[PDB]
Structure 1
Amino acid sequence: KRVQTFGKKKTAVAVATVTNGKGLIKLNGKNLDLVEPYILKTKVYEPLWLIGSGKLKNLDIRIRVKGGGQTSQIYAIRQAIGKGIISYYQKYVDESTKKELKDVLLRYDRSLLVGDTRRCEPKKFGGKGARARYQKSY
């Protein structure tokens, strides 16, 4: 019927509501036709390509993204999609198919199912960044 999972890259949680439908796939109120830059577009479409466009004619998808920059957001979206489709399959479709899909995803790469755990480390005094200290002249 309807399944809600998230992605996560840096801060940037893309929540993918995957429902029964005709196969549209959207972001907040906009088609995945947009995303934003033409270069990165492939990182969002990739899981779909892996799984096949015919498999998602049963499944509508909406995605709510919040927080983060651009690339991170894209990554989050991708992650959400990956988790989402697979989650749907695990519940309402068969198990074998789900397994197959998972295998395919693994063969392509990590990041689709399992998350990127990295996050901005606290800046420390005596410097501008995390490690980068100021400057001594003696």
Structure 2
Amino acid sequence: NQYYGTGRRKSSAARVFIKPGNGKIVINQRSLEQYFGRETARMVVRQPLELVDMVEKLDLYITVKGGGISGQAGAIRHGITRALMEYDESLRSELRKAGFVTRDARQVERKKVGLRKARRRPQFSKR
């Protein structure tokens, strides 16, 4: 009876499967502490399951592709919120307030012509 949500971020794509259980997190057949060598990402993947009180309540099977550390953590958070609203749907009133159900659409900006980057213009000289 797994409950599913897809989360996306900069260029990441998480596939979150929720089962009721004890709070076992498995990411790509790896533990969260093994996978993210970063406590901030360990926080943001545990943030909604402590917004609600469901740290010990449910186990989870996660696959995630693409991106970096914060990208995969953001899509994981957005998949977890998508699946907890699939589980209960009474939680949308709070996770909207938490800013979690909103998909962060901050893609990288393309390099433009003339410009050395997206917005950095080259150095100017009159003379």
2:13 aligned partner = 13
Aligned to 2:83: 84
Percent identity, please.
32
Q: What value does the CA root-mean-square deviation take over the aligned residues?
A: 2.0
Greater helix proportion = 1
1:36 aligns with 2:37: yes
* TM-score normalised by length of structure 2: 0.83
Q: How does 1:107-118 map to 2 (within 5 A)?
A: 107=97, 109-110=98-99, 112-118=100-106
* Contact persistence 2:15–2:79 (CA under 8 A): yes
- Aligned to 1:72, what secondary structure does the other structure show? helix
Residue 134 of structure 1 corresponds to which residue in structure 2?
122
Is 1:102 the counterpart of 2:92? The answer is: yes
Distance 1:23 1:44 in 2: 12
Deviation digits for residues 87-128 of structure 1 (CA, Å, limit 9, x no counterpart) = 133xxxxxxxx32x2223233x21x21201121121012122
Contact 2:3/2:17 (8 A) holds in 1: yes
Counting only pairs closer than 5 Å after superposition, residues 44-59 of structure 1 correspond to structure 2 as: 44-53=45-54, 57=57, 59=58
2:112 corresponding residue in structure 1: 124
User: Gaps (5+ residues) in structure 2?
Assistant: none
One-letter amino acid of the counterpart of residue 85, structure 1: L
Runs of 4+ in structure 1 deviating by more than 6 angstroms, as ranges, are: none
Flag structure 1 segments of 5+ consecutive residues without an equivalent. Answer: 90-97
Q: Work out the number of aligned pairs and report it.
A: 125
Superposed CA deviations along residues 25-83 of structure 1, whole A, max 9, x for unmatched, are 221111223422123321111111111137x63x4311111111111211111111111
Normalising by the residue count of structure 1, what TM-score does the alignment of the two structures yield? Answer: 0.77
- Matched AA of 1:64: T
